[PDB]
From Swiss-Prot:
It comes from Aspergillus aculeatus. Belongs to the glycosyl hydrolase 53 family. The gene is gal1. Gene3D superfamilies: Glycosidases (3.20.20.80). This is Arabinogalactan endo-beta-1,4-galactanase. The active site is at E136, E246. Its EC number is 3.2.1.89. InterPro entries: Glyco_hydro_53, Glycoside_hydrolase_SF. The keyword Zinc does not apply.
Length: 334
């Protein structure tokens, strides 16, 4: 089995609050984290926002969710978006209150932030397995200072965030991760790291893991073959483990905006297809040197079944019965 078989269920507290509840494969209602734990899932990814006006996914939100994750005996992977809202290649908005005019001040705020985040979990007796300094930062982070017009600033910021973690009171230092999107593209992965490391602002010793997103419905170029090559080269070039930190497969996709990759076009859109995809994906990761695992993204987000894609349903739970699909067992046993 893979070192990590995880799921990002960040939305959980928001759904439970809205009255949502789930049922195991026996139709017995039961806390989602315990349903997942028993199925084999051994790690939970949680997105963390800095100062969202409405509190969604902030530090307190994540503390409540992490408490339950620890209880169920699963590890914790904190996905720091380093923004007050969704962070990705098209939007890396610096937290309100943080600097968009002074790198010195910004580096300090980020260092203080990660230090504080880690310290707060330590004060709540919660260990952190993985923590990513940013989410999909291929186009940089904390704009404008961290735009790709300055890979030096990007490197200096990552260095600062990394050390905020290294300097924290967490008994064991969490694995520090850098996460980029389009994991199937070796050229994009390599350019980011080679360019950022070339400045000396970011040290190879500053981080531990490589994280990549891997989706099948945003481009026919996302073949398992390209992913295999990209993951293979990441480990061989930089000598660090790799992790697929985000992925989905539809149980229903009436009309995709994009053609699916060639080595995936035979997989049907159904629970069964979801299982076949996951096993085929796990195969690539397992066969890669230091391929640590796979994290499904938001398998239980009832009410947002499409999860931002052009497909109809990417969930691993039945949006009518609130009952989890058999695919959870497949993910748990990867
Ligand atoms: Ca997304």
């Amino acid at each position: 089995a893979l070192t990590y078989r995880g799921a990002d269920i960040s939305s959980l507290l928001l759904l439970e609050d809205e009255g949502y509840s789930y049922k195991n494969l026996n139709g017995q209602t039961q806390a989602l984290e315990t349903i997942l734990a028993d199925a084999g899932i051994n790690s939970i990814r949680q997105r963390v926002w800095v100062n969202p006006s409405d509190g969604s996914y902030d530090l307190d939100y994540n503390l409540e969710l992490a408490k339950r994750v620890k209880a169920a005996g699963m590890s914790l992977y904190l996905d720091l978006h380093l923004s007050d809202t969704w962070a990705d290649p098209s939007d890396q908005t610096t937290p309100s209150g943080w600097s968009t005019t002074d790198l010195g001040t910004l580096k300090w705020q980020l260092y203080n932030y990660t230090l504080e985040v880690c310290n707060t979990f330590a004060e709540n007796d919660i260990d952190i397995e993985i923590i990513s300094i940013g989410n999909e930062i291929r186009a940089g982070l904390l704009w404008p200072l961290g735009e790709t017009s300055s890979y030096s600033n990007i490197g200096a910021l990552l260095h600062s965030g990394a050390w905020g973690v290294k300097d924290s009171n967490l008994a064991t230092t969490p694995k520090i991760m850098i996460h980029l999107d389009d994991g199937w593209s070796w050229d994009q992965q390599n350019y980011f790291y080679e360019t950022v490391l070339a400045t000396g602002e970011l040290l190879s010793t500053d981080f531990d893991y490589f994280g990549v997103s891997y989706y099948p419905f945003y481009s026919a170029s996302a073949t398992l073959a390209s992913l295999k090559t990209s993951l293979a080269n990441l480990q061989s070039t930089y000598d660090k483990p790799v992790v697929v930190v985000e992925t989905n497969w539809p149980v229903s996709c009436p009309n995709p905006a994009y053609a699916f990759p060639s080595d995936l076009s035979s997989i049907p859109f159904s629970v069964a297809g979801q299982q076949e995809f996951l096993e085929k994906l796990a195969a690539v990761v397992e066969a890669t040197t230091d391929g640590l695992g796979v994290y499904y993204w938001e398998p239980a987000w009832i009410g947002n079944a499409g999860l931002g894609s052009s497909c109809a349903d990417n969930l691993m739970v039945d949006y009518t019965t609130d009952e989890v699909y058999e695919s959870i067992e497949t993910l748990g046993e990867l």
